[PDB]
Amino acid sequence: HKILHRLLQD
Amino acid sequence: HKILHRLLQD
Amino acid sequence: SLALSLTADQMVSALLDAEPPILYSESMMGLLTNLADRELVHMINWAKRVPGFVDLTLHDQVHLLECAWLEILMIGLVWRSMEHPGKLLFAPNLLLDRNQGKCVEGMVEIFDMLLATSSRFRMMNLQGEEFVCLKSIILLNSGVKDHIHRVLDKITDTLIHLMAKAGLTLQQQHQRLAQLLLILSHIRHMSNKGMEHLYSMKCKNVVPLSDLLLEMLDAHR
Amino acid sequence: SLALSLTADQMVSALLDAEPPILYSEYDPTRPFSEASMMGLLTNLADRELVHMINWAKRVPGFVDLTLHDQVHLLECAWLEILMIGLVWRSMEHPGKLLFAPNLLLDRNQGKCVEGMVEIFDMLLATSSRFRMMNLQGEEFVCLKSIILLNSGVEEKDHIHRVLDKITDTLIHLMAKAGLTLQQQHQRLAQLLLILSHIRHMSNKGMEHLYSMVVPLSDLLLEMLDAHRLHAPTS
Ligand SMILES: CC(=C(c1ccc(O)cc1)c1ccc(O)cc1)c1ccc2ccccc2c1
Ligand SMILES: CC(=C(c1ccc(O)cc1)c1ccc(O)cc1)c1ccc2ccccc2c1
């Protein structure tokens, strides 16, 4: 869940 | 031999 | 050969003619295994009646069938389930819904995907003439310029011919063609997960797969 | 609603500029090598590749127009597929070998000592061989790869559908520009997509091996794997 969400927001 | 092998023959 | 000798219309007739029948079922995996096993016998003679499949050597026929058998079984199920939103028509007497998928591992996950695919065909207004073309492709594309590619081109030309007949424009033809072939990827996926669970519950000694299913299964593993 | 307006040319350009780089492994050419952790190098490679893929996908026309969850779902389902098509793409010029990195070239015999490698290896070669004989072009490559991203997701995703049609029209444009007849454009379009199914096949084989079990998978690589857990596999 988390990690992919964070990497999709730059 | 194998069932698939035999059926393909006839 | 033979396949490369047929016109587009003659190719369609041969495939519609080659069509295997809809069977009836005879614990959930037991009924599905029994049905599948009986379906596989029809599929083999169906394959032999697919133009260009007999041109191949016996060795290549075994490979392609060992590779596509579950894919082909699934596109059949999906096809005849179209008139039943939210339910799967394995047989005219065995119409299962998503919920019948529980108890047994992986079935509800695979059911969802099969249902999804069925809705996709439903929205695309898939036709029988298109359906038999896709089934033939799956058979020829399961493995692994040459013969098989030359036949796949003939079937593609046939699909294009069918669409043009339906009244589709050139632009609508390559889009729909693309749309159809993309769904085949989902079919490959569902089949992969199907065999994966199949082999697992085979190891777990749960479902008694028939001899024919045991052989096909080990052709992957 | 901006990808739906892009012409075929400016569609290829957007995808071409979205292209992630080719990375290198941590392999050392000066010292002897051991196939006791090819999977370690591959894992480290795949992990670093994923980050670049994530941002590449965000530069795929129409992808951002989706919600996170959709973007997440597509990435979770297609990450290994996309890695495997890029790998196969750059392995065309090296028959019988897989070019994981310009410093990490792999032959069939490395396919040994490591379980599942051989089978997947031979599958990757065949796909590369098919692409090689089909003479796959770079413009076509980025098109097919973006389709995998948008199609691997097994109020209507009709947005994705309109974008899929877009990419399709783009491919036809390339083939027409190449000089293919209408029949050849159809046949070639068909063949390229048929090979995508094999890419689906190989990815699924790679998956069940990967989450069977050093191997020191990353935090992120564990996520992309667990998405293929209970949503599909088999305890
Ligand atoms: C859906 C399915 C099977 C099936 C496919 C087509 C058809 O016309 C009838 C049944 C099936 C195939 C072989 C079997 O031995 C049993 C069922 C299928 C495939 C794999 C599955 C794996 C886990 C759970 C359910 C499954 C159902
Ligand atoms: C081929 C492959 C991996 C890979 C794919 C693309 C790429 O650019 C680089 C490497 C790979 C993916 C994830 C990993 O954690 C490790 C390698 C791959 C995938 C699964 C395998 C399973 C068993 C044996 C070999 C495998 C290789």
Coordinates of C-alpha atoms and ligand atoms in Angstrom, one line a residue:
Chain A
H1 CA 0.0 0.0 0.0
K2 CA 2.2 2.8 1.4
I3 CA 5.5 2.7 -0.5
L4 CA 3.9 2.8 -4.0
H5 CA 1.7 5.7 -3.0
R6 CA 4.7 7.7 -1.8
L7 CA 6.7 7.0 -5.0
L8 CA 3.7 8.2 -7.1
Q9 CA 3.8 11.7 -5.6
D10 CA 6.9 13.6 -6.6
Chain B
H1 CA 1.6 -43.0 -24.9
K2 CA 0.2 -39.9 -23.3
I3 CA -3.6 -39.6 -23.6
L4 CA -3.4 -36.4 -25.6
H5 CA -0.9 -38.1 -27.9
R6 CA -3.2 -41.0 -28.6
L7 CA -6.3 -39.0 -29.2
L8 CA -4.7 -36.7 -31.7
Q9 CA -3.9 -39.8 -33.8
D10 CA -7.5 -41.0 -33.7
Chain C
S1 CA -1.8 -25.3 -46.0
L2 CA -5.6 -25.8 -46.3
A3 CA -6.0 -22.8 -44.0
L4 CA -4.0 -20.7 -46.5
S5 CA -6.4 -21.9 -49.2
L6 CA -9.6 -20.8 -47.6
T7 CA -11.3 -17.4 -48.2
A8 CA -12.3 -15.4 -45.2
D9 CA -15.9 -16.7 -45.4
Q10 CA -14.7 -20.3 -45.9
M11 CA -12.5 -19.9 -42.8
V12 CA -15.4 -18.9 -40.7
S13 CA -17.7 -21.7 -41.8
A14 CA -14.9 -24.2 -41.0
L15 CA -14.5 -22.9 -37.5
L16 CA -18.2 -22.6 -36.8
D17 CA -18.4 -26.2 -38.1
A18 CA -15.5 -27.3 -36.0
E19 CA -17.3 -26.0 -32.8
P20 CA -17.5 -28.5 -29.9
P21 CA -20.8 -28.7 -28.1
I22 CA -22.0 -27.3 -24.8
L23 CA -21.8 -30.1 -22.1
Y24 CA -23.6 -30.7 -18.8
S25 CA -22.0 -31.3 -15.5
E26 CA -22.3 -34.7 -13.7
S27 CA -17.2 -31.3 -4.5
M28 CA -17.2 -28.1 -6.5
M29 CA -13.8 -28.8 -8.1
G30 CA -15.1 -32.3 -8.7
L31 CA -17.9 -31.2 -10.9
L32 CA -15.7 -28.7 -12.7
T33 CA -13.0 -31.3 -13.2
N34 CA -15.4 -33.9 -14.6
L35 CA -16.9 -31.3 -16.9
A36 CA -13.4 -30.1 -18.0
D37 CA -12.2 -33.7 -18.6
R38 CA -15.2 -34.4 -20.9
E39 CA -14.7 -31.1 -22.6
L40 CA -11.1 -31.8 -23.3
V41 CA -12.0 -34.8 -25.5
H42 CA -14.2 -32.5 -27.7
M43 CA -11.5 -29.8 -27.8
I44 CA -8.9 -32.2 -29.3
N45 CA -11.2 -33.2 -32.2
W46 CA -12.1 -29.5 -32.4
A47 CA -8.4 -28.6 -32.7
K48 CA -7.9 -31.2 -35.5
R49 CA -10.8 -29.5 -37.4
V50 CA -9.0 -26.1 -37.1
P51 CA -7.6 -25.3 -40.5
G52 CA -3.8 -25.6 -40.5
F53 CA -3.6 -27.4 -37.1
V54 CA -3.1 -30.8 -38.8
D55 CA -0.5 -29.4 -41.1
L56 CA 1.7 -29.3 -38.0
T57 CA 3.6 -32.4 -36.8
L58 CA 2.1 -34.5 -34.0
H59 CA 4.8 -33.0 -31.7
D60 CA 3.7 -29.4 -32.2
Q61 CA 0.0 -30.3 -31.8
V62 CA 0.7 -31.8 -28.4
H63 CA 2.6 -28.7 -27.2
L64 CA 0.0 -26.2 -28.4
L65 CA -2.8 -28.2 -26.8
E66 CA -0.9 -28.8 -23.6
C67 CA -0.3 -25.0 -23.5
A68 CA -3.8 -23.7 -24.5
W69 CA -6.3 -26.2 -23.1
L70 CA -7.3 -24.2 -20.0
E71 CA -7.2 -20.9 -21.9
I72 CA -9.6 -22.3 -24.5
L73 CA -11.8 -23.8 -21.8
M74 CA -12.0 -20.4 -20.1
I75 CA -12.9 -18.4 -23.3
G76 CA -15.6 -20.9 -23.9
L77 CA -17.0 -20.5 -20.4
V78 CA -16.8 -16.7 -20.7
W79 CA -18.5 -16.8 -24.1
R80 CA -21.5 -18.7 -23.0
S81 CA -21.8 -16.7 -19.7
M82 CA -22.5 -13.4 -21.6
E83 CA -26.2 -13.7 -21.3
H84 CA -25.8 -14.2 -17.5
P85 CA -24.5 -11.0 -15.8
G86 CA -22.8 -11.9 -12.5
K87 CA -23.0 -15.7 -13.1
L88 CA -20.9 -18.3 -14.9
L89 CA -22.4 -20.8 -17.3
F90 CA -20.1 -23.9 -17.0
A91 CA -23.1 -25.9 -18.2
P92 CA -26.8 -25.2 -18.9
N93 CA -27.5 -26.9 -15.6
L94 CA -24.5 -25.5 -13.7
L95 CA -24.9 -21.8 -13.6
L96 CA -22.6 -20.6 -10.8
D97 CA -22.2 -17.1 -9.3
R98 CA -19.3 -15.5 -7.7
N99 CA -20.3 -16.8 -4.2
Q100 CA -20.2 -20.5 -5.3
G101 CA -16.4 -19.7 -5.5
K102 CA -15.8 -19.9 -1.8
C103 CA -14.8 -22.9 0.3
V104 CA -12.2 -23.9 -2.3
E105 CA -9.0 -21.9 -2.7
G106 CA -8.5 -19.4 -5.5
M107 CA -11.9 -20.1 -7.1
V108 CA -13.6 -16.8 -6.1
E109 CA -10.5 -14.9 -7.3
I110 CA -10.6 -16.7 -10.7
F111 CA -14.4 -16.3 -10.8
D112 CA -14.1 -12.5 -10.5
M113 CA -11.7 -12.4 -13.4
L114 CA -13.8 -14.7 -15.5
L115 CA -16.8 -12.6 -14.7
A116 CA -14.9 -9.4 -15.6
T117 CA -13.8 -10.9 -18.9
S118 CA -17.4 -11.9 -19.6
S119 CA -18.6 -8.3 -19.0
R120 CA -15.9 -7.0 -21.3
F121 CA -17.1 -9.3 -24.2
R122 CA -20.6 -8.2 -23.2
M123 CA -19.8 -4.5 -23.6
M124 CA -18.0 -5.2 -26.9
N125 CA -21.0 -7.1 -28.3
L126 CA -18.7 -10.0 -29.2
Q127 CA -20.1 -12.2 -32.0
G128 CA -19.8 -16.0 -32.5
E129 CA -17.8 -15.5 -35.7
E130 CA -15.3 -13.4 -33.8
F131 CA -15.4 -15.9 -30.9
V132 CA -14.3 -18.9 -33.0
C133 CA -11.5 -16.7 -34.5
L134 CA -10.2 -15.9 -31.1
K135 CA -10.3 -19.5 -29.9
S136 CA -8.3 -20.6 -32.9
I137 CA -5.7 -17.9 -32.2
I138 CA -5.3 -18.9 -28.5
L139 CA -4.5 -22.4 -29.8
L140 CA -1.9 -21.2 -32.2
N141 CA -0.4 -18.5 -29.9
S142 CA -0.1 -20.7 -26.8
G143 CA 3.4 -21.8 -27.7
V144 CA 6.2 -21.5 -27.5
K145 CA 7.6 -16.4 -41.2
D146 CA 6.6 -19.9 -40.5
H147 CA 3.3 -21.9 -40.9
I148 CA 1.7 -21.0 -37.6
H149 CA 2.3 -17.3 -38.1
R150 CA 1.0 -17.5 -41.7
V151 CA -2.3 -19.0 -40.3
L152 CA -2.6 -16.4 -37.5
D153 CA -2.3 -13.8 -40.3
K154 CA -5.1 -15.6 -42.2
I155 CA -7.3 -15.6 -39.0
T156 CA -6.5 -11.9 -38.4
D157 CA -7.5 -11.1 -42.0
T158 CA -10.7 -13.1 -41.3
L159 CA -11.5 -11.0 -38.1
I160 CA -10.9 -7.8 -40.1
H161 CA -13.2 -9.2 -42.8
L162 CA -15.9 -9.9 -40.2
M163 CA -15.7 -6.4 -38.8
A164 CA -15.9 -4.7 -42.2
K165 CA -19.0 -6.8 -42.9
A166 CA -20.6 -5.6 -39.6
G167 CA -20.1 -2.1 -41.0
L168 CA -17.1 -1.0 -39.0
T169 CA -14.8 1.7 -40.4
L170 CA -11.0 1.2 -40.9
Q171 CA -10.3 3.1 -37.7
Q172 CA -12.9 1.1 -35.7
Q173 CA -11.4 -2.1 -37.1
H174 CA -7.9 -1.9 -35.7
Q175 CA -9.2 -0.6 -32.4
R176 CA -11.6 -3.5 -31.9
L177 CA -9.0 -5.9 -33.2
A178 CA -6.6 -4.5 -30.5
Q179 CA -9.3 -4.7 -27.9
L180 CA -10.0 -8.4 -28.6
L181 CA -6.4 -9.4 -28.6
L182 CA -5.8 -7.5 -25.3
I183 CA -8.5 -9.6 -23.6
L184 CA -6.6 -12.7 -24.7
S185 CA -3.8 -11.5 -22.3
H186 CA -6.3 -11.6 -19.4
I187 CA -7.3 -15.1 -20.6
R188 CA -3.6 -16.1 -20.4
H189 CA -3.5 -14.6 -16.9
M190 CA -6.6 -16.4 -15.6
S191 CA -5.4 -19.7 -17.1
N192 CA -2.0 -19.2 -15.5
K193 CA -3.5 -18.7 -12.0
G194 CA -5.9 -21.6 -12.7
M195 CA -3.1 -24.1 -13.3
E196 CA -1.1 -22.7 -10.4
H197 CA -3.9 -23.4 -8.0
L198 CA -4.7 -26.7 -9.8
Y199 CA -1.1 -28.0 -9.3
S200 CA -1.2 -26.8 -5.7
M201 CA -4.4 -28.6 -4.7
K202 CA -3.1 -31.5 -6.6
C203 CA 0.0 -31.6 -4.3
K204 CA -2.4 -31.1 -1.4
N205 CA -4.2 -34.2 -2.6
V206 CA -7.6 -32.5 -2.6
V207 CA -9.2 -32.8 -6.1
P208 CA -8.9 -36.1 -8.0
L209 CA -7.9 -34.7 -11.4
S210 CA -8.5 -37.2 -14.2
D211 CA -5.6 -38.9 -16.1
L212 CA -5.9 -36.4 -19.0
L213 CA -5.9 -33.4 -16.6
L214 CA -3.0 -34.9 -14.7
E215 CA -1.0 -35.1 -17.9
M216 CA -1.9 -31.6 -19.2
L217 CA -1.0 -30.1 -15.8
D218 CA 2.4 -31.7 -15.8
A219 CA 3.1 -30.3 -19.3
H220 CA 3.5 -27.0 -17.6
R221 CA 5.2 -28.1 -14.4
Chain D
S1 CA -8.3 14.7 -20.8
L2 CA -5.2 15.7 -22.7
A3 CA -3.9 12.3 -23.9
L4 CA -7.1 11.9 -25.8
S5 CA -6.1 14.9 -28.0
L6 CA -2.4 13.9 -28.7
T7 CA -1.7 13.2 -32.4
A8 CA 0.1 9.9 -33.2
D9 CA 3.4 11.7 -33.7
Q10 CA 3.2 13.7 -30.5
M11 CA 2.0 10.5 -28.8
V12 CA 5.2 8.6 -29.7
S13 CA 7.3 11.6 -28.7
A14 CA 5.6 11.8 -25.2
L15 CA 6.3 8.1 -24.7
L16 CA 9.8 8.3 -26.1
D17 CA 10.7 11.1 -23.7
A18 CA 9.0 9.1 -20.9
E19 CA 11.5 6.3 -21.5
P20 CA 13.4 5.3 -18.3
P21 CA 17.2 4.8 -18.7
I22 CA 19.0 1.5 -19.0
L23 CA 20.6 0.7 -15.6
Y24 CA 23.7 -1.2 -14.6
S25 CA 24.2 -4.0 -12.0
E26 CA 26.6 -4.0 -9.0
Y27 CA 28.6 -6.7 -10.8
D28 CA 32.4 -6.5 -10.7
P29 CA 34.2 -7.3 -14.0
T30 CA 37.6 -7.3 -12.3
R31 CA 36.9 -10.2 -9.8
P32 CA 35.5 -13.7 -10.4
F33 CA 31.7 -14.2 -10.4
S34 CA 29.4 -16.6 -8.6
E35 CA 25.9 -17.7 -9.7
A36 CA 25.1 -18.0 -6.0
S37 CA 23.3 -14.7 -6.2
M38 CA 22.4 -13.8 -9.7
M39 CA 19.0 -13.4 -8.2
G40 CA 20.7 -10.9 -5.8
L41 CA 22.0 -8.8 -8.7
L42 CA 18.6 -9.2 -10.5
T43 CA 16.7 -8.2 -7.4
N44 CA 18.9 -5.2 -6.9
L45 CA 18.5 -4.4 -10.6
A46 CA 14.7 -4.8 -10.7
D47 CA 14.3 -2.8 -7.5
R48 CA 16.2 0.2 -8.9
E49 CA 14.4 -0.2 -12.2
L50 CA 11.0 0.0 -10.5
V51 CA 11.5 3.5 -9.3
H52 CA 12.3 4.7 -12.9
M53 CA 9.3 2.7 -14.1
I54 CA 6.9 4.4 -11.6
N55 CA 7.9 7.9 -12.9
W56 CA 7.9 6.7 -16.5
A57 CA 4.2 5.5 -16.1
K58 CA 3.4 8.9 -14.7
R59 CA 4.7 10.3 -18.0
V60 CA 2.5 7.9 -20.0
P61 CA -0.3 10.1 -21.5
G62 CA -3.5 9.5 -19.6
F63 CA -2.1 7.6 -16.7
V64 CA -2.1 10.5 -14.3
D65 CA -5.7 11.2 -15.2
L66 CA -6.5 8.1 -13.1
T67 CA -6.9 7.9 -9.3
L68 CA -4.0 6.7 -7.2
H69 CA -5.7 3.4 -6.4
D70 CA -6.1 2.7 -10.2
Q71 CA -2.5 3.9 -10.8
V72 CA -1.5 1.6 -8.0
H73 CA -3.5 -1.4 -9.3
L74 CA -2.1 -1.1 -12.8
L75 CA 1.5 -0.8 -11.5
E76 CA 1.1 -3.8 -9.1
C77 CA -0.3 -6.0 -11.9
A78 CA 2.1 -5.0 -14.7
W79 CA 5.5 -4.2 -13.1
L80 CA 7.2 -7.6 -13.9
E81 CA 5.6 -7.6 -17.4
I82 CA 7.0 -4.2 -18.2
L83 CA 10.4 -5.2 -16.8
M84 CA 10.3 -8.3 -19.0
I85 CA 9.4 -6.5 -22.2
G86 CA 12.1 -3.9 -21.7
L87 CA 14.6 -6.7 -21.0
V88 CA 13.5 -8.6 -24.1
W89 CA 13.6 -5.4 -26.1
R90 CA 17.3 -4.8 -25.4
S91 CA 18.1 -8.5 -25.8
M92 CA 17.2 -8.6 -29.5
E93 CA 20.8 -7.8 -30.6
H94 CA 22.2 -10.6 -28.5
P95 CA 20.5 -13.9 -29.6
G96 CA 20.8 -16.7 -27.0
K97 CA 21.6 -14.2 -24.3
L98 CA 19.6 -11.9 -22.0
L99 CA 20.9 -8.3 -21.7
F100 CA 19.8 -7.4 -18.1
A101 CA 22.3 -4.6 -18.1
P102 CA 25.0 -3.4 -20.5
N103 CA 27.5 -4.8 -17.9
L104 CA 25.3 -7.8 -17.0
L105 CA 24.9 -10.1 -20.0
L106 CA 23.5 -13.6 -19.3
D107 CA 23.8 -16.8 -21.3
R108 CA 21.7 -20.0 -21.0
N109 CA 24.2 -21.8 -18.8
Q110 CA 23.8 -19.3 -16.0
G111 CA 20.3 -20.8 -16.1
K112 CA 21.4 -23.5 -13.7
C113 CA 21.9 -23.8 -9.9
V114 CA 19.0 -21.3 -9.6
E115 CA 15.5 -22.7 -9.7
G116 CA 13.0 -21.5 -12.3
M117 CA 15.6 -19.6 -14.3
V118 CA 16.0 -22.0 -17.2
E119 CA 12.3 -22.1 -18.0
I120 CA 11.8 -18.4 -17.8
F121 CA 15.1 -17.9 -19.6
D122 CA 14.1 -19.9 -22.6
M123 CA 10.7 -18.1 -22.7
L124 CA 12.4 -14.7 -22.7
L125 CA 14.7 -15.7 -25.5
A126 CA 11.7 -16.9 -27.6
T127 CA 10.0 -13.6 -27.1
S128 CA 13.2 -11.7 -27.9
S129 CA 13.7 -14.0 -30.9
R130 CA 10.1 -13.4 -32.1
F131 CA 10.5 -9.6 -31.7
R132 CA 13.9 -9.9 -33.4
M133 CA 12.5 -11.6 -36.4
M134 CA 9.5 -9.4 -36.4
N135 CA 12.0 -6.5 -36.5
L136 CA 10.4 -4.6 -33.6
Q137 CA 10.9 -0.8 -33.8
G138 CA 11.6 1.5 -30.9
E139 CA 8.5 3.5 -31.7
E140 CA 6.4 0.3 -31.5
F141 CA 8.2 -0.8 -28.4
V142 CA 7.2 2.1 -26.2
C143 CA 3.6 1.7 -27.5
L144 CA 3.3 -1.9 -26.6
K145 CA 4.9 -1.3 -23.2
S146 CA 2.4 1.4 -22.3
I147 CA -0.4 -0.9 -23.3
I148 CA 0.7 -3.5 -20.9
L149 CA 0.6 -0.9 -18.1
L150 CA -3.0 0.1 -19.0
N151 CA -4.3 -3.4 -19.9
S152 CA -2.8 -5.6 -17.1
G153 CA -5.5 -4.3 -14.8
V154 CA -7.7 -7.4 -15.2
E155 CA -17.6 4.2 -12.9
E156 CA -16.1 2.6 -16.0
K157 CA -12.4 2.6 -16.9
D158 CA -13.6 3.8 -20.3
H159 CA -10.9 6.5 -19.9
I160 CA -8.3 3.7 -20.2
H161 CA -10.3 2.3 -23.1
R162 CA -10.2 5.6 -25.0
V163 CA -6.4 5.7 -24.3
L164 CA -5.9 2.1 -25.5
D165 CA -7.6 3.1 -28.8
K166 CA -5.3 6.0 -28.9
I167 CA -2.1 3.9 -28.7
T168 CA -3.6 1.5 -31.2
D169 CA -4.2 4.3 -33.7
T170 CA -0.6 5.3 -33.0
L171 CA 0.8 1.9 -33.9
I172 CA -1.2 1.8 -37.2
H173 CA 0.3 5.3 -38.0
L174 CA 3.8 4.0 -37.5
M175 CA 3.3 1.0 -39.8
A176 CA 1.6 3.1 -42.4
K177 CA 4.5 5.5 -42.2
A178 CA 6.8 2.5 -42.6
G179 CA 5.0 1.6 -45.9
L180 CA 3.0 -1.4 -44.7
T181 CA -0.1 -2.2 -46.7
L182 CA -3.4 -2.1 -44.8
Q183 CA -3.3 -5.9 -44.5
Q184 CA 0.3 -5.9 -43.2
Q185 CA -0.7 -3.2 -40.7
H186 CA -3.5 -5.4 -39.4
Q187 CA -1.3 -8.6 -39.3
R188 CA 1.6 -6.9 -37.6
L189 CA -0.6 -5.1 -35.1
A190 CA -2.1 -8.5 -34.3
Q191 CA 1.2 -10.3 -34.0
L192 CA 2.7 -7.7 -31.6
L193 CA -0.3 -7.9 -29.3
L194 CA -0.2 -11.7 -29.4
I195 CA 3.3 -11.6 -28.0
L196 CA 2.0 -9.5 -25.1
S197 CA 0.1 -12.6 -24.0
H198 CA 3.4 -14.5 -23.7
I199 CA 4.8 -11.6 -21.7
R200 CA 1.8 -12.1 -19.4
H201 CA 2.7 -15.8 -19.3
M202 CA 6.3 -15.2 -18.4
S203 CA 5.5 -12.6 -15.7
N204 CA 3.1 -15.1 -14.1
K205 CA 5.8 -17.7 -14.1
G206 CA 8.3 -15.2 -12.7
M207 CA 5.8 -14.3 -9.9
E208 CA 5.1 -17.7 -8.5
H209 CA 8.8 -18.4 -8.4
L210 CA 9.6 -15.0 -6.8
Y211 CA 7.1 -15.3 -3.9
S212 CA 7.9 -19.0 -3.4
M213 CA 10.9 -17.7 -1.4
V214 CA 18.1 -14.4 0.2
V215 CA 16.4 -13.7 -1.9
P216 CA 16.7 -10.2 -0.3
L217 CA 13.7 -8.5 -1.9
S218 CA 13.3 -4.8 -1.1
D219 CA 10.5 -3.2 0.9
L220 CA 8.9 -2.0 -2.3
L221 CA 9.6 -5.2 -4.2
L222 CA 7.7 -7.0 -1.4
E223 CA 4.7 -4.8 -2.1
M224 CA 4.6 -5.4 -5.8
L225 CA 4.8 -9.2 -5.0
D226 CA 2.2 -9.3 -2.2
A227 CA -0.3 -7.6 -4.6
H228 CA 0.0 -11.0 -6.3
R229 CA -0.9 -12.6 -3.0
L230 CA -4.4 -13.7 -2.1
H231 CA -5.6 -11.6 -5.0
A232 CA -4.5 -14.6 -7.0
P233 CA -2.1 -17.3 -5.6
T234 CA -2.3 -20.4 -3.6
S235 CA -1.1 -20.7 0.0
Ligands
LIG1 C1 -12.9 -22.3 -14.3 C2 -12.1 -23.5 -14.1 C3 -12.3 -24.7 -14.8 C4 -13.1 -24.7 -16.0 C5 -12.8 -24.0 -17.2 C6 -13.6 -24.1 -18.3 C7 -14.8 -24.9 -18.3 O1 -15.6 -25.0 -19.4 C8 -15.1 -25.6 -17.1 C9 -14.3 -25.5 -16.0 C10 -11.6 -25.9 -14.4 C11 -10.7 -26.6 -15.1 C12 -10.1 -27.8 -14.7 C13 -10.5 -28.3 -13.5 O2 -10.0 -29.5 -13.1 C14 -11.5 -27.7 -12.7 C15 -12.0 -26.5 -13.2 C16 -11.1 -23.4 -13.0 C17 -9.7 -23.5 -13.3 C18 -8.8 -23.5 -12.2 C19 -9.2 -23.3 -10.9 C20 -8.3 -23.2 -9.8 C21 -8.7 -23.0 -8.5 C22 -10.1 -22.9 -8.2 C23 -11.0 -23.0 -9.3 C24 -10.6 -23.2 -10.6 C25 -11.5 -23.2 -11.7
LIG2 C1 14.0 -12.0 -15.4 C2 13.6 -11.7 -14.0 C3 13.8 -10.5 -13.3 C4 14.1 -9.3 -14.1 C5 13.1 -8.8 -15.0 C6 13.4 -7.6 -15.8 C7 14.6 -7.0 -15.6 O1 14.8 -5.8 -16.3 C8 15.5 -7.4 -14.7 C9 15.3 -8.6 -14.0 C10 13.7 -10.4 -11.9 C11 12.6 -9.7 -11.3 C12 12.5 -9.5 -10.0 C13 13.5 -10.1 -9.1 O2 13.4 -9.9 -7.7 C14 14.6 -10.8 -9.7 C15 14.7 -10.9 -11.0 C16 13.2 -12.9 -13.2 C17 12.0 -13.0 -12.4 C18 11.7 -14.1 -11.7 C19 12.5 -15.2 -11.7 C20 12.2 -16.4 -10.9 C21 13.0 -17.5 -10.9 C22 14.2 -17.5 -11.6 C23 14.6 -16.3 -12.3 C24 13.7 -15.2 -12.4 C25 14.1 -14.0 -13.1

